[PDB]
């Protein structure tokens, strides 16, 4: 079998293949995650270079791993499918062996472990993908939001963004998001998520996707018109 060590250390102590995988994430469309008091919202950019697209059947950016956990990403689209499939299999495997659905922290730790494994296994390259994993643990009303990256490190975030121009939207979130008082309602949480994407997106038409996840496996995706109403209200307040 092909055993070639592709991910290796350089004289300065860097693993270039893992670092170049982060550059693939930088190229990917922007993804944002914001957790409110009783919910988490996942926002995603859709680049408008591709029109004549069939939005019914085109792979959505946010993916359900289980009925209570979702996963969005930035980076190589094909790579993300492999992580999502593995995550979905592990979620059912956990229910089957332990008789409880996975916690969001556990699912994140598994996906992060897969990414790490691909940084020190022979004949494979790292995943060019960073993920945002969000949801609610079974019988728990505390929101969960985690991030992973090609190296395999993961951590919990009050709010976070990844992908192209993520530096800008992170700048926005750092000054706008208050820890002492997070978005109390769904509206406030979605509004803040849309506002953050409007710093980068371009047009607020079909370029913004929003997915709201609430406790007890209550997950819904907002439509174009529903999002467009947020876009309208934000700019009308801005004209002042």
């Amino acid at each position: 079998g092909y055993d070639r060590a592709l991910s290796i250390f350089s004289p300065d102590g860097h693993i270039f293949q893992v670092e170049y995988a982060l550059e693939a994430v930088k190229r990917g469309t922007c993804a944002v995650g914001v957790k409110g008091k009783n919910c988490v919202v996942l926002g995603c950019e859709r680049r408008s270079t591709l029109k004549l697209q069939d939005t019914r059947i085109t792979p959505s950016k946010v993916s359900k791993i289980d009925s209570h956990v979702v996963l969005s990403f930035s980076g190589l689209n094909a790579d993300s499918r492999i992580l999502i499939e593995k995550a979905r299999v592990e979620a059912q495997s956990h229910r089957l062996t332990l008789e409880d659905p996975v916690t969001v922290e556990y699912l994140t730790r598994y996906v992060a472990g897969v990414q790490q494994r691909y940084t020190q296994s022979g004949g494979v390259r790292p995943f060019g993908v960073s993920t945002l994993i969000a949801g609610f643990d079974p019988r728990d009303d505390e929101p969960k939001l985690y991030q992973t990256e090609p190296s395999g490190i993961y951590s919990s975030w009050s709010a976070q963004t990844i992908g192209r121009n993520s530096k800008t939207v992170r700048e926005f979130l750092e000054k706008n998001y208050d820890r002492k008082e997070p978005p109390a309602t769904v509206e406030e949480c979605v509004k803040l998520t849309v506002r953050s994407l409007l710093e980068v997106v371009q047009t607020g038409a079909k370029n913004i996707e929003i997915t709201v996840v609430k406790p007890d496996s209550d997950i819904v995706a907002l439509s174009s018109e529903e999002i467009n109403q947020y876009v309208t209200q934000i700019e009308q307040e801005k004209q002042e």
Partner: protein
Amino acid sequence: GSRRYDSRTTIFSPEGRLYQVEYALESISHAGTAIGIMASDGIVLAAERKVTSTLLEQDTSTEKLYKLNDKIAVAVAGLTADAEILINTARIHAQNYLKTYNEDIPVEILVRRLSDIKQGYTQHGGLRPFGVSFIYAGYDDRYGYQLYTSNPSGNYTGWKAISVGANTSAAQTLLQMDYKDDMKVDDAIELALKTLSKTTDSSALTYDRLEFATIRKGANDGEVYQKIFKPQEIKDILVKTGIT
């Protein structure tokens, strides 16, 4: 040892691109243009054969349009030999699904499977990727008529109208201009041929330089029919639309 001669096909560039995937796409850009157009009452697949000869046996020839099952077909752009490897895998996958669930395979599931195979060659194994881009035209009872494309990266996307191969930039602009959502198959047939006629590198578009196919609910009652056009039938539709 052997390491000396390894090209390392599955690595990132400093910019975060996959070298071999990008170079495979460069190969595909020189291949004959293939177009897919989805209408409300069917799908059209049109494709241009590359600089043919008069001594080529056209009626028994197939380099662009292939049948995966009774409901799904593909247009090819790139290395034909590479495409046939994948096509036969897709045909088997469709039959496996039918044997397991006793239902025809949904279009997307077949597309995802093939795209996952392409993905694998970019991440592990140390082998060159498949130099192939597909346009998938198919029907199922969930989403109805569907157009997809996949490329050597293993990434796939859904489309109302799309082109692959040579002159896709020019072709996509022409399709974006004249395409409408309430369009019908007969109109889509005309759009596909008109787009090829303007984007072609050849002097004139003729029947012997084309492969054509439609997927219609224009079959007797609630069912779907695949029509791979014969040379004489391509000649007739070229006269009908007013190109020759």
